[PDB]
Amino acid sequence: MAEIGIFVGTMYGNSLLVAEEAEAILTAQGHKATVFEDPELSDWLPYQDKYVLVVTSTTGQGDLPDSIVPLFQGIKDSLGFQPNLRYGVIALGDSSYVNFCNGGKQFDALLQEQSAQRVGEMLLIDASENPEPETESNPWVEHWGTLLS
């Protein structure tokens, strides 16, 4: 039975709420999930022989949240290649602007630039018109969790 590192990138907690639901769903299906609200390469590392998943957002001029910048730089510069990494991605932000989920999209790109192999398609939550993001992400995690071991 699989184990899932559930790495988070936020400055306001809305993507973190979805990550806590994602951990609960995978745990209920039977997989040993673990959510990380303040992650590091040291917590990403234990899952390269396994599976991982991302729940992230956007900040500044369209940059990654500072809570996941040290994970994004760490994997980019001190890991470099991941041909056997398997995962899934949820991204969350405001639809009112051109950088729609651009910080979460950069974290999916962190893994495709390293030859990882996602077990699904990236979910894009529009918080400014979607005040119940659980309803946009729970059936997505329940589905993705059937594609594990």
Q: Which of 46, 36, 48, 41 is nearest to 7 (CA)?
A: 36
> Which conformational region is residue 147 in: left (phi greater than 0), alpha (psi within -120 to 50 degrees), or beta?
alpha
Contact flag: residue 15 with ligand FMN (CB under 6 A): yes
Contact predicate 9/103, CB 8 Å: yes
Contact flag: residue 134 with ligand FMN (CB under 6 A): no
d(CA 97, CA 1): 41
Site for ligand FMN (CB under 6 A): which residue of 2, 3, 14, 37? Answer: 14
From residue 82 to residue 121, the character string flagging contacts with ligand FMN as x (rule: CB under 6 A) and all else as - is ----------xxx--x-xxx--------------------
Contact flag: residue 58 with ligand FMN (CB under 6 A): yes
Using the minimum distance from each CB to ligand FMN, give the nearer residue, 76 or 100: 100
At closest approach, how far in Å is the CB of 27 from ligand FMN?
A: 22
Helix or strand holding residue 78 (H, E): helix 69-78
Contact flag: residue 10 with ligand FMN (CB under 6 A): yes
Contact flag: residue 12 with ligand FMN (CB under 6 A): yes
Contact flag: residue 136 with ligand FMN (CB under 6 A): no
Q: Let me know the angle formed at the C-alpha of 70 by 139 and 76, rounded to the nearest 5 degrees.
A: 85
Helix or strand holding residue 23 (H, E): helix 14-29
Using the minimum distance from each CB to ligand FMN, give the nearer residue, 66 or 147: 66
Contact flag: residue 137 with ligand FMN (CB under 6 A): no
Task: Tell me which residue has tokens 């991605």.
Answer: 89
List of residues contacting ligand FMN (CB under 6 A): 10-15, 57-60, 62, 92-94, 97, 99-101, 127
